[PDB]
């Protein structure tokens, strides 16, 4: 699993408030 993961890096870092 190589993809996907900058999906995730965009949405995880919203939740970094």
Do not use: N, T, V
Not at 1 to 17: A, G, T
């Amino acid at each position: 699993e190589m993809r996907l993961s900058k999906f995730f890096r965009d949405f995880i870092l919203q939740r970094k408030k």
